[PDB]
Structures are given as structure tokens and as C-alpha cells.
Amino acid sequence: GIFGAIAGFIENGWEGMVDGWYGFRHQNSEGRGQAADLKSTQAAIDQINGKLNRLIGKTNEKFHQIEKEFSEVEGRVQDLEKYVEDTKIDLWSYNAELLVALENQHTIDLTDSEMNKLFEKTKKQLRENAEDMGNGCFKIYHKCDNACIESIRNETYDHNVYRDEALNNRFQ
Amino acid sequence: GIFGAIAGFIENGWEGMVDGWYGFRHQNSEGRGQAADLKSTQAAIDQINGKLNRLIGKTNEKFHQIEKEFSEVEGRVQDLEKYVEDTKIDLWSYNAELLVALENQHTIDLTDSEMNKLFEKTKKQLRENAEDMGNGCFKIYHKCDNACIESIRNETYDHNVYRDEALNNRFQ
Amino acid sequence: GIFGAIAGFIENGWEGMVDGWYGFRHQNSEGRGQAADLKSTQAAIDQINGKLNRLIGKTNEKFHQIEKEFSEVEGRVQDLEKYVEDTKIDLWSYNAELLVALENQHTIDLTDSEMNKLFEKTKKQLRENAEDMGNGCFKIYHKCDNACIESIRNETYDHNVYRDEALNNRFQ
Amino acid sequence: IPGNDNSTATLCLGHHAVPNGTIVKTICNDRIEVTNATELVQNSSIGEICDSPHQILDGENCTLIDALLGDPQCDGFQNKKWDLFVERSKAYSNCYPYDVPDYASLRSLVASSGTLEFKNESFNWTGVTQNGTSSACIRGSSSSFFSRLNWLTHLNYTYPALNVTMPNKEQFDKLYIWGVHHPGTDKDQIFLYAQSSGRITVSTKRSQQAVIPNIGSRPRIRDIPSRISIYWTIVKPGDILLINSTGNLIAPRGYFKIRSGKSSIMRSDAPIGKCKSECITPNGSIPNDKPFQNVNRITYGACPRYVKHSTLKLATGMRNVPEKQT
Amino acid sequence: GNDNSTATLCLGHHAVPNGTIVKTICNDRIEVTNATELVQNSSIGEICDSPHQILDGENCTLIDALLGDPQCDGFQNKKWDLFVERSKAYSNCYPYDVPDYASLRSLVASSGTLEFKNESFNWTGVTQNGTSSACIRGSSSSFFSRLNWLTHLNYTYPALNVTMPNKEQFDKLYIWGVHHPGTDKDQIFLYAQSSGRITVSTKRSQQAVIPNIGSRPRIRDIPSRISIYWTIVKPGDILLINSTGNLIAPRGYFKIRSGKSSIMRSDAPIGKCKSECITPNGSIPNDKPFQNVNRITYGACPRYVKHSTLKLATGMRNVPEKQT
Amino acid sequence: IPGNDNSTATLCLGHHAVPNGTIVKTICNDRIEVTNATELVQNSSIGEICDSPHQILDGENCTLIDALLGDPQCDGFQNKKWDLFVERSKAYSNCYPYDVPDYASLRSLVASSGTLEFKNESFNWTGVTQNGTSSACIRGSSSSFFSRLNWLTHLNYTYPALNVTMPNKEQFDKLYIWGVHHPGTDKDQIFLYAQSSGRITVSTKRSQQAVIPNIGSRPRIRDIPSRISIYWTIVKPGDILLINSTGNLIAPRGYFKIRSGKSSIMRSDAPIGKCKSECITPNGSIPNDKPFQNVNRITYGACPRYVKHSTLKLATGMRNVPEKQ
Ligand SMILES: *[C@@H]1O[C@H](CO)[C@@H](O[C@@H]2O[C@H](CO)[C@@H](O[C@@H]3O[C@H](CO)[C@@H](O)[C@H](O)[C@@H]3O)[C@H](O)[C@H]2NC(C)=O)[C@H](O)[C@H]1NC(C)=O
Ligand SMILES: *[C@@H]1O[C@H](CO)[C@@H](O[C@@H]2O[C@H](CO)[C@@H](O[C@@H]3O[C@H](CO)[C@@H](O)[C@H](O)[C@@H]3O)[C@H](O)[C@H]2NC(C)=O)[C@H](O)[C@H]1NC(C)=O
Ligand SMILES: *[C@@H]1O[C@H](CO)[C@@H](O[C@@H]2O[C@H](CO)[C@@H](O[C@@H]3O[C@H](CO)[C@@H](O)[C@H](O)[C@@H]3O)[C@H](O)[C@H]2NC(C)=O)[C@H](O)[C@H]1NC(C)=O
Ligand SMILES: *[C@@H]1O[C@H](CO)[C@@H](O[C@@H]2O[C@H](CO)[C@@H](O[C@@H]3O[C@H](CO)[C@@H](O)[C@H](O)[C@@H]3O)[C@H](O)[C@H]2NC(C)=O)[C@H](O)[C@H]1NC(C)=O
Ligand SMILES: *[C@@H]1O[C@H](CO)[C@@H](O[C@@H]2O[C@H](CO)[C@@H](O[C@@H]3O[C@H](CO)[C@@H](O)[C@H](O)[C@@H]3O)[C@H](O)[C@H]2NC(C)=O)[C@H](O)[C@H]1NC(C)=O
Ligand SMILES: *[C@@H]1O[C@H](CO)[C@@H](O[C@@H]2O[C@H](CO)[C@@H](O[C@@H]3O[C@H](CO)[C@@H](O)[C@H](O)[C@@H]3O)[C@H](O)[C@H]2NC(C)=O)[C@H](O)[C@H]1NC(C)=O
Ligand SMILES: *[C@@H]1O[C@H](CO)[C@@H](O[C@@H]2O[C@H](CO)[C@@H](O[C@@H]3O[C@H](CO)[C@@H](O)[C@H](O)[C@@H]3O)[C@H](O)[C@H]2NC(C)=O)[C@H](O)[C@H]1NC(C)=O
Ligand SMILES: *[C@@H]1O[C@H](CO)[C@@H](O[C@@H]2O[C@H](CO)[C@@H](O[C@@H]3O[C@H](CO)[C@@H](O)[C@H](O)[C@@H]3O)[C@H](O)[C@H]2NC(C)=O)[C@H](O)[C@H]1NC(C)=O
């Protein structure tokens, strides 16, 4: 949304992937080597658990309160006790609304930042050997046998050994 | 988060083009042309209508509030009704100041990211046939006319036909 | 949120900076000269100055309040006195803990985005004669002396003067 | 070849900008210029109170309590219903002075009923003079009393101890308004009741409302020394009402219907206009579309929340450059 | 077959077709891949008894158990953490009505104890253990177990001047009443005088009750009525009673101490589980930070809101399947 | 290496860092090191109340009601104006025992006025002997009574029916304080008033108060069993005050002027010192720069709102790198 990762960046979701939140999928002569990156996922699961721990498991200690239901009518004293409880409810009802609305907008922006980081960190490894083709997919312009996907996920890619062949094929 | 939009790649843009909030300005051989992107504007409009509809038209109905004006001094009861009167308004006044402060910041940051999203989407469609000037202008580096504008946006763009032109002009 | 996270992609900074919040470092035959900048301070200190302006210096005053401590027990009139006081404190405590959570998360994201904001600005100025080194550094591929680094801080740099010598060593 | 050399069109950008924008405050800064903004607080009133959605009963220099007791200047208020009762500041009573402990309590609960359906109830009244008349309280250019009360004096020269009751057999609860007379001197005590001492014990199956009629001299209002103290009792559909007297009793002529409703009461002096609006303030009726208000803190209906802040701008655009100053 | 130069790499995020609606600022109908409920809209239907002690109402009112009603004799010397009162409770004994019923109910509920010790007042010239035909215990007449009903001894009434000073380091509570006879003959038959006046005093505060004579609506073939008052005796003070006629003699004191005990009104039965929060609808789990079953609660309980539900997003934007 | 340096210039970026970190709680990553943080709650007090704004009036073994009735110990509070009356737990009354109905009403009404501008006015007392004297109370090493009250005693063996009027000719409110005597013995009442019965009525054109004394035996405090219940009336301008009573009337000496202002009442034990501050608490005084506090809920003046929290921190910087890998 904020980073524009939904409207035209990926353009679709994946339904068959239930073993991870972020993954790498590629197509070549070998096969579909789908794999997941648990390091970026650990940031999201640690954040959402910490937010819940501030909310769940927290109780407020209240023992004695004023009477709320009355079977007999009384003067201004009855009207004040009925009014003061309603003011507590309305303030707590509205504070509950912002305790839901604000964090829902926050968690949408935060998940797109992880997607934006994952998209941008691939560009850092491939300085000039990768350009997006308009649907969230990068073209590599050299061979990507099984050693490539191990380097990308582990962030151990070295561009020096693949520099000469990639630039030669793309230009001339 | 601002992203350096107003003080960066704008440089005191024109006040005109009242058709849309965002658009493109070009100066080709024939002359000048303007075109407002209606899709990006409608995305921000739905956000504002979502914010307004939360507050407007959703008032709460109250009937028999307590007396809030006394022409004569009274004892313990008057000091209690006046106090709950004062502390209720102070909570809402701080609540109202807190409400409009976050929404205005959220509105400004979202609109800045919308211009960044259009900035990103344009440069994704151009692999190496573009070069940013640094103030909101894109160097085309190839021949272009009015046939560009209809093709660049509405899912009918081809980049391979104009690829050969930029290699000769940019590096020589 | 997060943005570059100032950890990972970039690393530990310099602890000796006592005259600024941001700086630059260059490597050449002259030295390792480092200095701060006042350009980013104007967009930075205005946030903190505006943050404490609404809190410090603006306080609602009170003149008369209800009695909150009782040395003797009474009936329903005393129980309502303690009930309205507990509700007032608890709501203010809930707003105070939530407000410092929202402001600090907003403050962290902005100062993390400021480093990311300037990273794109340097990349836009250095169009094709410089490449990202990956570890939070810019690779220049050509000589850039002390007169050269002045144009970077002035945000006015010409690429045509050094385009020829940088391009030949970039591809080789 | 006008210098373009067929190189670039530069594909530059733009934005919407207004040179007369508004100032909107936020977390980061309180002096940010925005292209367009709107106000969430309505600080204006039409000066008139409208009554299209809710039925409003004009005070006409009559408050609620004297309408409940029936002063001769409030004769038109018999058997009328309201959704909101307005009271004028210039209200006055032209009859005998009435006092009541917890005056705001009876004012609040009668207003919440929202009706004045009063039904006359038969009683015995044997050996006691009924239909009391009084000179200073004039109705129709003639001596009279409150419409909903009945001043009881002695018959001949005897005042038998009244032991009367009136069971309730209906579903709706009954509301009674009965007063106790406090004569100025002991001469008035003998002349009107032929008995020096007296006391009233009124009891139901759930509550007792006994009161002693203390005698004394008060400052004169319209040249009388006496005062009247009003008390109210409410009878459930199960139990009954019992009245015992030995002097200084002003028994009611019936019962008042009480029911839950949306009615209320407020003090105002603005005139009544003709429009459609769900909110009523003592200043006047205001539109309720805005979420916040600062017109007044007294509300009825769907009025917005009262905020101390005067202006609350909400941004509807983007940041605007100062223009031609860079 | 695919060429080696046609290598591509794509990125994305997972999605589930079973999306749920989550209300937020942007739109009220945005689908999220997963969400959890933040409010508790359901209850078990009964009150568990394990973290706190709950004393069953058993068709008894708290004031009735305080005075010692014959139908409610099983509540003697019992302590509670949360008293419950049944909505169908009724009493068939001497009719009573107190000034400030909400006051006397609340203060004894705060202490939560009914510890009692017998004090021997110095009575003389009067009779004790006064009984009435309205209340039946063991096929015989009786009265409240904690109030001593005073009648006449011979055709005389002594000038009472009796006191009971306190020297212990805790606060007492003397439940003393006043009796309102129905007829003047009953006034003569019980005290043999025209009228009576009662005044009690401590070092700090004093009370004075003037009983009234008159007919009242008949309840169980008796028109008499009793009104019960109370007083608090601090250490170092003294309670002095001077009265003649219509006096209800207290039989002792009720211990008062600060605590977490309270009172609630419900009709649900009891249960056995580890839940802590108690509502009249029943016990509810505390994992939800909000609840809407009722605004009346006891113990560690979440806040009350009027909203039906509150959905919080725990995932990214959920794109539903492909375009088709 | 000078050889490699010829065409390998580098430009890196970094941010400010500090070796000592501060933990700031927020919605995500509650244990995060922050370069610089500012406190939001002030929990430290000097322990003495500052005097430099509006003057505070010390208790000095005296309370507000005792200063109102004119106790011999409270003679220093005659027509003294304040904006904050402070009370002490060591204050006690030894002149004569008294009790009032609705103590919170009269305590707040006098404290809200904050003025004791007493103005003695003439009356028409006939047939009675004023200025009652009790040996229990000592004023200036001599037996006396309350300075602002009149304990009416009989003349010869006759007590007339008092009917006194008191019109108002000025446009401000007046507070009249009248009490009723409750003797402890039947012999005492017949000796002082020569009448077993007794009834006191005070009436205005808006409200009336009427009470009767309750004769009976009461516990002795400082060799006296009798009591006086204190009652107060408010007379609006244009109203006529009428008092009709037969015995046991504690006649007022005058009236107390009532003003509307910021005067209130507090109870504490902190001493008074010479210092400058705007907020006053029972525990002392604190600066009002911070918008939150946790020291005490009862406050007077410009004070921050009470918060049930140990401390609150606000991050004023970026996340700190853990340093050295
Ligand atoms: C107790 O004292 C009060 C206050 O003085 C007495 O009230 C006053 O009574 C006199 C005699 O009736 C009133 O004077 C009369 O007033 C009107 C004027 O139009 C008229 O009827 C007569 O010409 C005569 O002047 C006087 O107004 C009244 N004072 C007030 C303030 O109303 C009261 O009578 C005394 N009580 C007893 C039992 O005597
Ligand atoms: C409640 O109603 C009963 C109805 O019986 C009242 O009892 C009656 O009260 C009157 C006085 O109000 C008694 O009369 C008195 O009797 C003797 C002998 O004559 C003497 O003390 C007096 O001279 C006077 O006449 C009467 O006997 C008594 N009973 C009956 C059967 O009539 C009772 O007073 C009422 N209570 C109140 C507060 O009004
Ligand atoms: C959507 O997210 C929620 C949490 O926000 C998931 O609910 C949680 O799901 C886990 C799955 O392991 C539950 O743990 C298991 O629950 C039961 C009962 O204890 C039992 O099978 C296991 O012992 C284990 O603990 C967990 O209780 C549950 N949390 C709550 C609060 O219900 C939910 O599964 C997610 N939805 C999907 C479709 O993944
Ligand atoms: C003053 O009026 C009250 C209210 O009417 C009288 O109380 C009523 O007295 C009658 C006669 O004693 C009672 O009727 C009796 O009730 C029972 C029914 O089991 C039984 O003893 C007799 O068969 C007879 O019907 C009646 O219940 C009672 N209460 C009511 C509410 O009517 C009172 O007697 C009157 N006082 C005087 C002094 O006349
Ligand atoms: C407080 O207690 C005292 C006693 O300590 C009570 O005084 C007593 O009052 C009664 C009348 O209520 C007196 O009886 C009368 O005495 C004389 C004897 O010549 C005569 O007038 C009558 O024939 C009658 O018998 C009694 O003597 C008196 N006691 C003493 C010791 O003086 C007082 O009434 C009590 N007050 C209350 C409110 O209970
Ligand atoms: C952490 O940041 C805070 C601000 O959030 C720094 O507080 C700074 O403290 C100084 C010294 O008190 C302030 O200087 C002030 O200047 C004038 C003239 O003297 C006057 O208003 C005060 O007397 C005071 O001296 C300064 O404004 C304030 N803020 C800033 C932004 O510098 C604090 O020093 C920082 N901590 C560290 C360890 O750097
Ligand atoms: C009702 O009983 C109470 C409690 O016993 C009586 O109060 C007590 O009255 C006696 C009267 O002799 C007081 O004793 C005297 O005290 C002082 C001590 O300095 C002195 O004047 C005498 O030497 C004598 O000892 C006693 O202090 C007092 N006790 C209390 C706690 O106040 C009360 O008098 C009785 N009332 C009636 C009407 O009989
Ligand atoms: C209110 O004040 C009036 C006077 O302003 C009081 O009325 C008067 O009361 C006295 C007794 O206190 C009466 O005197 C008695 O009159 C007859 C005939 O002589 C007889 O019973 C006695 O021998 C005695 O003298 C007097 O007549 C009466 N009226 C007047 C006009 O003076 C009234 O008592 C006061 N009320 C209260 C509650 O204080």
C-alpha cells in the first residue's frame, strides 16, 4: 500500500505456499526450486508476539464498584451514578477503536517494508546484472544452476566471477 | 515518511493542471502536453472518504444528561457533579487534539509515498532507456512523439523496439 | 517502518561525532576527512522542538477539586467519590502509556528513513558513473579529490566533467 | 532545428498547488501549510430552536414544578406530553409559595416521565371540609388554589383523624404529589383546623414518608406568613397507598402517570423556529453532522461531543510549496 | 526446454482464499489473511469457585442474613469474598425497612465478614428475648437472632442509662433499631407510656430517632414496622444509649475490616474451574482484553465496550487467488 | 596501499552512536537501545511548599472550621484571606465539643470562598443575657466562649419569644451561622432557659431550616456532656432573614462575606519555605515542566495529571548499533 507492493508490484498472491511467509521462486532448465527465507520471517513473528504480550495477559484489578442496575427510581443521586458509568463506557469504547484502527494500518505498512527490503536487497547483490521486467520478477542474464540460489539466500553472492560473462552477453 | 518529495524532486512545480492532483509534463519537438493519471488520484480519494465517514454521520444519541448549570451554591453533591463535568471534557479535548494530529501526519506521509510509487512504477517500465536528472525529470534518450503516451501507461508498451536507439546515443 | 534498519546493510558508525548527527567519510591519497552537515539538521531538530512544544509550556490549571482521602467510612456518597477518581486516573494512565508508544515508534521510523532518504539522493546525482559497494558505501571508479567532495555536500555536481574517464574503467 | 536536436522531452512532473492554503497542525510541526483543509468543529448557531423531529413544549413563564402543581398562569399545560421541556428565566409564581426538599430530584423524575396525564380519584372525605379556597391565589378573577391539590380544613368545629387508602389495580405505576401546610401563627392553626398539634404518617409496603408540620413565622410573600411543603410518593402496582392525618394535610386529587421515555429538560430563552435538526442547545439548534462542537456543553439528542479547542483542521490534500521563494 | 540465458527470479508473499474482514482507517472491508478476535462475546453460564470464595444466596438477602432471619439461620459466622443475591429471594418474617439501604448493604459487603462475639449489656428493670407471632421457628414464635426485642416489665419503665465502652484495636458496628407500633393500644401493651424517644451518641458523632405512631398497610396480619440504624465505634471511644420505649436492643457487634470483598447480583449456579473473572452472565476468560457480556464484574476482568466485535490484523494484505 | 588508491575512491555513510544505551518501550521491540531519551514523569520532591505565588495560610494546630467559629487557639486567623488553606493532623479543638451535619458541605463552602471578612452588625436582643461562659474553655488565661457566637442565657426567670429581622441593603451574599444547644441533663436545661421544651426556626424568602434539640445523656468530653449542632444559611441580596426560637439558640454575631475564586483546601504536614513554584502537592512541590506525574493525586494549581506508572521514556534519537559485531 504505502510502498506500493500490492497494486502493481507483485500483482498476485501465492496460495499453495503455506510453509512460509516469504519465498524465492525461479524458473530454469533444472526445475522450480522454491525455497523460503526464515531470517526475514523471524522479524515479523517476533514483532507481532511482542505486541500481543503488551496486550494479552494484562489484567486490571477491580473489586468494588457502584451499583449499576436499579429496581427503584431515585432522584439526582441515581441519575449521577447512571451518567458516570456511561461516560466510562464511551471513553473506553472509543479508545478501543484507536487501539484497533491504528495498529491495523501499522501492520500493513510494516509487512510491506519487509517486502520492500527483500526486493531491494536483491538489487544490492546484482549491481548491474538485474533489471525488473514489470511484474516483480528480475532477469539475471547468466546461468543460475543450483549454486546461484544458495548464494542469494545466504547472501554470499560474488559478482567478480560472473562479471565478464554477464556483461558480454547482454551488450554484444 | 516524506521521502524527500517536496524539497527534493519537485523544485516548485506549476500551480496549474486542475484536472488531476498528479500528472506528467513534457516538452517534445511539437510542443507541450499534459496528462493527469486518474487512477492514482482515485486511490487517495478513497482514503479520505474512509477517514471522513468514520466521524461524520456516526454520532451518538444521548437523552437525559445531568444538570450542568447551578445558579446557587450547594454542598457535597454540587462539587461532585461539577468535577465529573470538568474531567469528562478534559479527556475529550485531549482526545480530539490527539485524533487530528495522527491523521494529518498519516495523510501527508501517504500522499508523499503515492508520488514515490508513481516515480517507482515509471522507472520500472524503463530498463536502461531512462536516466534520472535528480529533480523530477526523466531523460528519454530516444526519439518519442504522442504515440508514446497512449502506449506507456495502458498496458500496451514494448521496450525492445526502442532498446537499440539508446545504446548509440547515451555512450556516444 | 524499519526502512534500512541502520544495521545489516550498513554497520557501526563513528562515536567521535560530538558536533552533529550525520557525516561523510572519503578515502583518497589525502586523508580520511570527516565532517558533519547542517542541511539535515533543519529537517531533524524541527521535529523534536515541535514535539516538546505541545507538552512543555501548555498545561491546564485546576483551582478546586473533590476530596480524595477519607479518614472515616460513609455510604453511597463516599463510594462514588472513589469510583470517579479511579476511572480518571486509569484512563489517563492508558493514554500516557499508549502515547509514548506511538510517538517513539514514529520517531524511530523517521530518523531511520532519513539515512535512506539521503542514500537515494546521492544515487540520483551519481547517475551512471558510480555504483553501490553494498556495505553502505559508494564505489566511484574514478579519482575524486577534496575539491570533488565539496560538490557533493553543496548538492550541485556536474556529471559531464568526469563521465568519460569513469565510463571506461566501469566496464573495461 | 530549434535547439532540441531530437534528444529528450525530459518527462518532467508536477503537482496541485494553491497559493492561499490553510495552516494545519500535527505531530511534527504546528505551522504546516496544506492546500486544502476542513473544520471538524461547528462554532455557529442559527439562534432558533426547531421542533420537527422532537416535540418541544414552550415554558411560557412556567417551570416544570408549578406546571405539575397547576398555577392559574399555567392552565394550558394540563394533559400535555413533551420530548424536551424548556424553561424561561423570567418565570414566576402568582400563587402561594411552595417549597420542597431535593427540588432538583422531583424536577428530574417528573421530566423523565414525559407526560402529565392526571386522573381524578374518588375518596371518602367524611367530616372534613374539601375544596379549599384562598384569596391571594386567584384563578379566573376568583379565589382558588392549585389545580392538582386539595386543601383540607375542619368541618363545623371538628377534625376527625383521617384513615383513608386507595389501592392500585393497574399495571402502570402511580405518582402522588401531596403537600403539608405550615401556618404562620397558632391563630391560623386554630382557625383553619381547630387542633393545635398535628402530624402526618404516610406509609406503603416499601417506604415511609412521615413528616411533622412545624409551625413558625416566615417573611411575607404577597402578605401571607404561611408556607407549603410538597412531598411525593410512588406506588408500585403490587402495593397500596395509605394516608393518615390529624391536621395540616393537603391531599392530592388523584395520581400522575409515570413512564419511561426520552424526555428531558433544559433552560433556554431562544425563540422557536421551523427547521429540521436533531440537536438542541440553549444557544439554539445546530447541525449535527460535525463530530465535535464548542457551542455549549448542554446537549440533547444527537449533539456532537463538546471540545474545548476552537479550531480543529483536518488535512485533505498535501504539502504546498511557498511558491517563487526558492 | 528452457535456455540458460532465460533465467528469471520472482518474489512475492503468500495468501489464503479464506479471508476475513478487518476494520481499519483505509476501508472497513479490507480482507486480511488471518485475524484474531479481541473481545469476548460468550460466557460459560455459571460461576466457578476456586480462586475466590463465593457464598450462595440461597433465597436470602444480605440484610436478612445480617439481622438473623429464621429462614436464613445458616449464615451465622460465615465469611465471603463475593456475596451473591438471588432475584427470587423473599422473606416471611417481621417487616423491616431501613434508611439508606444502599449504604448499609455496601459497607458490610466491603468488609465481607460477619464475625460476632456476645456482649453482656447491663440491663435492669426490662424484659429480654421479646418474641412475635409473625416469625415462626420450630413451630414456635421467635425473632431476629441478632436483635433483642424489648418489652415492658410490670407497669413501669426504668430510666435507662447503659453503656459499653470499647478498648480493642479494631472497629465495631452496633446494629440497633427502632420499633414503630401500629396502634396506641399496642404502644400501651408493650411499653405502658404515651410516647418514647431514643438517642445514642459516641465521642465523634451522635444519632437521634423519634419513633412515630400510626397505621401502616398490613403485612402478614401485623401493621407494626421496624427501622434499623447503625453506628461505628472507633477505639478509644464509647457508646452511650439513653432511651425509653421502642428500643431494639443490640446483641453485639459486627467486625469491620478493609478487604477485597464485594457483592454482585446474579442467578447463575456455581461451578468448579480456574477462571477468575466473574460476571452475572457467568465466568469469562481473561485472554480477551475487552468484553461485552455485562458492565458489572468482580476481580481481574477486562474492559467493557459496546462494540459487537473488534478484528485486529496479524498479516499482510491478502490478495484473493489469481484474477479468475 | 598507494598503488591501489589511484582509482579506488570510496564514499560511505554512517550515523551518530553512543556506547551507553537507554531502553525505551514502544509498540514494537520493547527492549531497544536508544541513543538519547527524556523523562516524562517527575517523581522527586523537595519536601517543602514553595511560597512566592499567592500566599498559603498554615494550620498551626488549627483547622478551617475552628478558625470559623473563633477558637482561642485560632485567634491568629481573624479576617485573614488565603487561596490555599493547609491543615495538619496534629490540630485539635479543646474549647467546646461540636458536631455538624454534612461536614463536607460546610468545609468546602468556606474553603471555596477563602475569605473571612467578618462584619459585626447590631441586633435587638431584649429580655435575655448574652455572652455565655463555660469554665471548660480558656481564652487568654480566662474563661470565655467562641468569639463569633452568642450563647443566650435567661434573664431573671423569663425567656421571651424571639422574633428578630435582618434585612439586606447591599448587593452581595452573606453567610449566617447559627447553632442549637443540646444540654446533657434535664436539670441543666431548666436552669438555663426555664423551659423544658425548645424549638428553633430560621426562615428566608427562598429556603427555611427548622430543627429541635434532642435532650438526652451524652458521653462527657473535658467535663461537659452537652453538644451544639452548627447550621448555616445563605442569604441572597434582597432577602429578609427571620429567626424565631425559644431557647437553645446559638445566636450569630454577624456574617461571613463570600467571594468566588481559586481558593481551595489541602491537608499535609510539609513545612513552609521560601522558594518559587506553581504546583502544590501534599508531599511538597514539583515543577510543572513534565506533563505527567506519579507523586500524589491531590493537586492544586497548574499540575500535571496523575499517572500510575513508575517511569516513562521518550526516544529522541535512532536505534543504537550494538557495536563490535
Ligand atoms: C415577626 O417579625 C416580622 C418582621 O417584622 C413580622 O412581619 C411583619 O408583620 C407586620 C404586621 O403584620 C407587617 O406589616 C404590615 O404590612 C403590610 C404592608 O402593606 C400591611 O398589611 C400592614 O399595613 C402592615 O404594615 C410587615 O410587613 C411584616 N414584615 C415583613 C418583612 O413581611 C411578623 O409579623 C412578626 N411575627 C409575629 C407573630 O408578630
Ligand atoms: C393514625 O390514624 C389513627 C386512626 O385511629 C389515629 O388514632 C387516633 O388518634 C386520635 C388523635 O389523632 C385519638 O384521639 C385522641 O384520643 C384520646 C381520648 O380522647 C385523647 O388523647 C385525645 O383527646 C384525642 O381525642 C384517637 O383516640 C385515635 N384512635 C381512633 C380509633 O380514632 C392516629 O392518631 C393517626 N396518626 C396520625 C399521626 O395522624
Ligand atoms: C491466525 O493466528 C492465530 C494467532 O494470532 C492462530 O491461532 C493460534 O494457532 C495456534 C496453532 O498452533 C494454536 O496453538 C495450538 O492450539 C491448540 C489449543 O492449545 C492446540 O492444538 C495446541 O496445543 C496449540 O497450542 C493457538 O492456540 C492459537 N491461538 C489462539 C489465541 O487461538 C491461528 O491458528 C492462525 N490461523 C491460521 C489459519 O494459521
Ligand atoms: C386504618 O385503615 C387501615 C387500612 O384500611 C386498616 O387496616 C385494615 O384493618 C382491617 C380491619 O382490621 C383489616 O382487615 C382484616 O384483615 C385480616 C385478613 O386476614 C383479618 O384479620 C380480618 O378478616 C380482616 O379482614 C385489614 O387487613 C387492614 N389492612 C388493610 C390494608 O386494609 C386499619 O384497621 C384502620 N385503622 C383503624 C383504627 O380503623
Ligand atoms: C436520659 O436519662 C435520664 C435519667 O438518667 C432521663 O431522665 C428521667 O426522665 C423521666 C421522664 O422521662 C423522669 O421521670 C419523671 O420524674 C419526676 C419525678 O418527680 C416526675 O416529673 C414524673 O413523675 C416522672 O417520674 C425521671 O425522673 C428522670 N430521671 C432522672 C434520674 O432524673 C431522661 O429522660 C433520659 N432521656 C432520654 C431521651 O431517654
Ligand atoms: C538529549 O536530548 C535532550 C533534548 O531532547 C537534550 O536536552 C538539552 O538540554 C540542554 C541543557 O539543559 C538544553 O539547553 C537549554 O538552553 C537554553 C539556554 O541555556 C535554556 O532553555 C535551558 O536552560 C537549557 O540550557 C537544550 O535545549 C536541550 N535540547 C537540545 C535539543 O539540545 C539533552 O542534552 C540530550 N542528551 C544528551 C546526552 O545529549
Ligand atoms: C450514664 O452513664 C455514663 C457512663 O458511666 C455516665 O458518664 C459518667 O458520669 C459520671 C458522673 O459521676 C462521671 O464521673 C465523674 O467524672 C469526673 C472525673 O474527673 C468528675 O466530675 C467526678 O469525680 C466523677 O468521677 C464520668 O466521668 C462519666 N463517664 C463518661 C465516660 O463520660 C453518665 O453520667 C450517665 N448518665 C446519667 C444521666 O446518669
Ligand atoms: C414565633 O414567634 C411568635 C411571636 O412572634 C410566638 O408566638 C407567641 O408565643 C408565645 C409563647 O412563646 C405566646 O404567649 C402565650 O400566649 C397565651 C396567652 O397569654 C398563653 O398560652 C401563655 O400565657 C403565653 O403568654 C404568644 O401568645 C404567641 N403570640 C404572639 C402574637 O406573641 C411563637 O411561639 C413563635 N414560634 C416559635 C416556633 O418559636
Ligand SMILES: *[C@@H]1O[C@H](CO)[C@@H](O[C@@H]2O[C@H](CO)[C@@H](O)[C@H](O)[C@H]2NC(C)=O)[C@H](O)[C@H]1NC(C)=O
Ligand atoms: C476541500 O475539499 C473538500 C472535501 O474534502 C471540498 O468540500 C466539498 O465541496 C464539494 C463541492 O465542491 C461538495 O459537494 C462537498 O460536499 C464538499 N465536502 C465537504 C466535506 O465539505 C472543498 O471544496 C475543498 N476546498 C477547496 C478550497 O478546494
Ligand SMILES: *[C@@H]1O[C@H](CO)[C@@H](O[C@@H]2O[C@H](CO)[C@@H](O)[C@H](O)[C@H]2NC(C)=O)[C@H](O)[C@H]1NC(C)=O
Ligand atoms: C451560548 O450561550 C452561552 C451561555 O449559555 C454563552 O457563553 C457565555 O457567553 C457570555 C457572553 O454572552 C460570556 O461572558 C461567557 O463567558 C460565556 N461562557 C460561559 C461559560 O458562561 C455563549 O457565548 C453562547 N454562544 C453563542 C455562539 O452565542
Ligand SMILES: *[C@@H]1O[C@H](CO)[C@@H](O[C@@H]2O[C@H](CO)[C@@H](O)[C@H](O)[C@H]2NC(C)=O)[C@H](O)[C@H]1NC(C)=O
Ligand atoms: C447478560 O446478562 C444481562 C443482564 O441480565 C443481559 O442483559 C439483559 O438481557 C435481557 C434478556 O431478557 C434483556 O431483556 C435486557 O434488556 C438486557 N439488559 C438489561 C440491562 O437488563 C444480557 O443479555 C446477558 N448476555 C448474555 C450474552 O447472556
Ligand SMILES: *[C@@H]1O[C@H](CO)[C@@H](O[C@@H]2O[C@H](CO)[C@@H](O)[C@H](O)[C@H]2NC(C)=O)[C@H](O)[C@H]1NC(C)=O
Ligand atoms: C505522600 O505522602 C503520603 C502520606 O504520608 C505517603 O503515604 C503513602 O500513601 C499511600 C496511599 O496514598 C499508601 O499506599 C502508602 O503506603 C503510603 N506510604 C508510603 C511510604 O508510600 C506517600 O508515600 C507520599 N508520596 C510520595 C510520592 O512521597
Ligand SMILES: *[C@@H]1O[C@H](CO)[C@@H](O)[C@H](O)[C@H]1NC(C)=O
Ligand atoms: C559550496 O562549496 C564551497 C567550496 O567549493 C563552499 O565554500 C561553500 O560553502 C558551499 N556552499 C555554498 C552555498 O556556496
Ligand SMILES: *[C@@H]1O[C@H](CO)[C@@H](O)[C@H](O)[C@H]1NC(C)=O
Ligand atoms: C406569562 O405567561 C402567561 C400565559 O401564557 C401570559 O398570559 C402572560 O402574559 C405572561 N407574562 C408576561 C409578563 O409575559
Ligand SMILES: *[C@@H]1O[C@H](CO)[C@@H](O)[C@H](O)[C@H]1NC(C)=O
Ligand atoms: C366514609 O367514612 C365513614 C366514617 O368512617 C364511613 O361510615 C363511611 O362508610 C365511609 N364511606 C365510604 C364511601 O367509604
Ligand SMILES: *[C@@H]1O[C@H](CO)[C@@H](O)[C@H](O)[C@H]1NC(C)=O
Ligand atoms: C357543630 O358544632 C357545635 C359546637 O357547639 C355542636 O353543638 C353541634 O352539634 C355540631 N353540629 C354537627 C352537625 O356536628
Ligand SMILES: *[C@@H]1O[C@H](CO)[C@@H](O)[C@H](O)[C@H]1NC(C)=O
Ligand atoms: C431457600 O433456600 C433454602 C436453603 O437452601 C432451601 O431449603 C429452600 O428450599 C429454598 N426455598 C425455595 C423456595 O427454593
Ligand SMILES: *[C@@H]1O[C@H](CO)[C@@H](O)[C@H](O)[C@H]1NC(C)=O
Ligand atoms: C450494673 O449496673 C448496676 C446499677 O444499675 C450496678 O450496681 C452493677 O454493678 C452493674 N454491673 C456490672 C457487672 O457492672
Ligand SMILES: *[C@@H]1O[C@H](CO)[C@@H](O)[C@H](O)[C@H]1NC(C)=O
Ligand atoms: C558506558 O560507557 C562506558 C564508557 O565507554 C563503558 O565503560 C561502560 O561499560 C558503559 N556501560 C554499559 C552498561 O555498557
Ligand SMILES: *[C@@H]1O[C@H](CO)[C@@H](O)[C@H](O)[C@H]1NC(C)=O
Ligand atoms: C427592639 O424592638 C422593640 C419592639 O417593641 C422596640 O420597641 C425597641 O425600640 C427595639 N430596640 C432597639 C434597640 O432597636
Ligand SMILES: *[C@@H]1O[C@H](CO)[C@@H](O)[C@H](O)[C@H]1NC(C)=O
Ligand atoms: C423576676 O421574676 C419573678 C417571678 O416570681 C418576679 O416576681 C420578679 O418581680 C421578677 N423580677 C424582675 C426584676 O423582673
